[PDB]
Every structure is written in structure tokens, then in C-alpha cells.
Symmetry: D2
Subunit: 123 residues, 4 copies
């Protein structure tokens, strides 16, 4: 079976994301939903856009996407691979770069954070 | 006067990219012609897709994009900020993650490279 | 009651490391026995050397260390923080860069992998 | 000729570092000097400790080091390779991870920044 990006996902920090159909070029869009208090009610939703690599039509493709945050001046990109895990579940293993806005090119060196996220299906 | 992603850029490793118009949502597409590759595969031009953050209509906005490589199974994402020094020169300062495809989730841990690229506008 | 790096740890990929006493400068040495490698080389135990930040004598201090691999030409650095949940469990949350050796500076751009590891105390 | 870590270096942001002799195990110590105003007088000096890989005694070894900052609770690690550049000069091409202290394990996801530094000899 193929690991497919389309559907609803949640990650190891409680964020959720929904990705729509992936077209013939590999392109998808979706929404990324995050709480703005850890274990609390305030929820904000931002669009994401990206692609799945379709070379050799792998059953476990790599992909990447950009989340265009609507509640700050930052941007995050995620890249990873859609696996069928050893337990037979679909999992997206991703790493990300979070770019903050700085005012002066002299502060550019501290504007990028890095981390991972693992997503599994919300069914 | 605002740093705009539209147009033609080159980086410190000799790669080029072109980016078309940015829509009012911040979305753009482009093409990336890479000078370097991790595979021994023949390189080719590959599409990219991304967004520029439009919050507070910054003069120097953050942005990100995904390069959907067409000559391998990998994906790279870039993110950075468009800077504009006063005389008027624009620079894109970016960082990227290059994701390779691995056959087994056991190898996932070594599938992600990181680095930087600085882009400047392709000379007239 | 403070999160201390001294002792024996294991990570989410099955690797182990031992770390000896932390001196009053924050310096420690250890050994790292890796479960995984990017090369197809036979793994072996490798020394590590690092420091824990002693500013404000934090209960949960940041730290970093370098693993000087003995079965390849690579180096990996880890950095992270020692957390201690109230019942008393310690966790090291780290990120690392794995540097491969390349023969030509032209290839430097693809020589650095990044990822995470979470370590917990090796079970009695 | 060998690229050797020992000596004084400066980087693309104006920081300086001095690394002592590298012993038979690959170990070195040194000092990392940084300004706490960009283009200004206030200078702070922190120790660094690390190793150079000595497998196959390469003329261009990889290495890594940790800077134990003495003016904050953060730590940085650098890793890279000592090259003889195409112009015949020694250059250290490095990337680093800067770990900030957070109070709550729930904020751990944003505590790591990433960037590069290129060092050349101050002679
Ligand atoms: C940050 C966020 O939106 N988290 C949601 C959570 O509130 C909801 O309970 C769950 C339902 O599956 O999906 C996730
Ligand atoms: C941050 C720092 O210490 N920078 C120093 C700079 O002040 C000095 O002029 C130079 C001498 O080579 O070395 C570098
Ligand atoms: C980039 O464009 C320049 C200027 O036209 C060209 O000379 C060079 O070959 C191009 N590099 C690539 C990788 O296409
Ligand atoms: C780690 O230590 C555990 C517990 O002793 C042992 O079972 C396992 O084989 C070790 N893993 C490695 C990579 O040495």
C-alpha cells in the first residue's frame, strides 16, 4: 500500500493539519492548526502549500510544505517522508525550520530554529 | 521600497532560480536550476512552490518554498528573509533542509541535511 | 534536586552513552555506543567530550558534547537540556549535527545531517 | 599540507577564536571571543572544548567543539571540516546549534537555533 499525505494528521505536540488531494504534479494545499496556549482553548488556523515528490512513484514519498503563519510574521517549512511504519501505520517523519523576521541583516544569524515533528492520522 | 521575491536569482554555489509574480495571498511558483546534487544523477530544472508572509506587509518579508526535484526522489525546503540595503541591493538569506528518500523507516534518522544559501539578483 | 548528566543513558534509537563526573567547570567525558551509522562500517564505542553550562547553577542546565567517532572519519555534536519532571524522572532532549568528511570543499554543502535524540536513564 | 585547527581564527560575523595544540587523541581546548554590541567595544571570552577526528589522519579532518558561554545559560556546538580551500588557504567550514535554556519541557521545541560560520586565519 501507498502512504498518502491527504487527510487529517496530528503531531507529537498536539498540532493538527489537514492536507487535501495531491494532484498529478505532486502539489497539495491544506491547513495547519495550532493552540496558542499549551493545553488550552485558543486555536489558530494557517494555510500550507507544498509538494510531494513523484519521481519513481514511491509508495513512501518525500515531501515538503510551507506554513504561512497568519498570526505572526514568521514562516515555517517542513520536509519529510510518508512512511508505512513497522507497525503498518502511516507516519510522516518531518523536520522543520522556523524563520523569524529580524529588522537588521546583522541579526539574520539568529533568525532560524530547527526541530522535528512526527505526525500520525486522526481518524 | 520593498524586497520582492519576483525575478531571477543566483546563489553562492552557482545555482539559479526564477520566481514569478507573488499573488495577494503571498503564493508564488518558480523554477530552480541547481549547480550541485548529492546523487550522481544528471541535474534538471525543477519547479518550486512557496509563500511569502504578508503579515504587516513587511518591506523585508520572511518566506519559504519547496523545491520538488525532478531528477531524484528528494525534496528540499528553503526558508529565509528578503533583505534590502538602502542604496537598493536585495539579498535573500536562506536556510534549507534537503530530505533524501530512504527505503526503511529505520534509516530516517540520517535522511535530512541542512545548510544555507545566499541569493542575489541575476546581473543584467 | 538537579538533573545531572553523570551516569548511563539510552536513546530512542537503542544507542547508549555513559558520562562520568562533571567537574566544577562543567566539563565531562563519556563514551557513546551507537546503534546506527551512515557508513557501512562496523560500529565501535567512541569517546565523547563536552560541557554543561554552569551559569546560575540551573537545576535543568544546557549542555553540549562532541562524539569523536572511532570507526569513521565523521564527528557528531549534540546539544540540549537536562529536564527533571517532579516525581523525579530525568530526560535529555537533544539535537545533533552529524558532519561527514568530504574530499573536496566543493562538496561541503551536503556534508551536514541534523536530527534529534531523547535519552533516558538506563534501567536498573 | 595538513589543515590544522591550532591558532587564531576569525569568522564571517567578526567573532574570534583561539584553539591550542591538538593532542594525540584529537582533543583541544580554546577560547571563543565575541562582541556584545555589533561593531562595538564590549568583548566577552568563553572557553571551548572539543575534538578533531583522527581516523586515517586526514589532511582535512572533521571536528566539533562546544562553547560553554560564560555570559548566559546557553550552549553552542560547532562541527565542520578543516579544508585547504581552492585558493590554498585554510578554512574551517562549520555549522552550529545554539541551545537556549527553557523552563518548561513544553517549550523545548523552540530552544534550538541553527546556522553556519566560516573561519579563516587571523595572522
Ligand atoms: C490544536 C488543536 O486544534 N488540537 C485539536 C484538539 O483540540 C482536538 O481535540 C483534536 C480532535 O481530534 O484535534 C486536535
Ligand atoms: C569580537 C572581537 O574580539 N573581535 C576582534 C577585533 O576586535 C580585533 O580587532 C581583531 C584583531 O585581529 O580580532 C577580532
Ligand atoms: C545561471 O545563469 C547564469 C547566467 O545566465 C548562467 O551563466 C549559468 O550557467 C546558470 N547556472 C545554472 C546552474 O544554470
Ligand atoms: C545498550 O545497553 C543495553 C542495556 O545493557 C544493551 O542491552 C544494549 O545492547 C546496548 N545497546 C548498545 C548499542 O550497546
Amino acid at each position: 500500500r501507498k502512504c498518502s499525505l491527504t487527510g487529517k494528521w496530528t503531531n507529537d505536540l498536539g498540532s493538527n493539519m489537514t492536507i487535501g488531494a495531491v494532484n498529478s504534479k505532486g502539489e497539495f494545499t491544506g491547513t495547519y492548526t495550532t493552540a496558542v496556549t499549551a493545553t488550552s482553548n485558543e486555536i489558530k488556523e494557517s494555510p500550507l502549500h507544498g509538494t510531494q515528490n513523484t519521481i519513481n512513484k514511491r509508495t513512501q514519498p518525500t515531501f515538503g510544505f510551507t506554513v504561512n503563519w497568519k498570526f505572526s510574521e514568521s514562516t515555517t517549512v517542513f520536509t519529510g517522508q510518508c512512511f508505512i511504519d513497522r507497525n503498518g501505520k502511516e507516519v510522516l517523519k518531518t523536520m522543520w525550520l522556523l524563520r523569524s523576521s529580524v529588522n537588521d541583516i546583522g541579526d539574520d544569524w539568529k533568525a532560524t530554529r530547527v526541530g522535528i515533528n512526527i505526525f500520525t492520522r486522526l481518524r
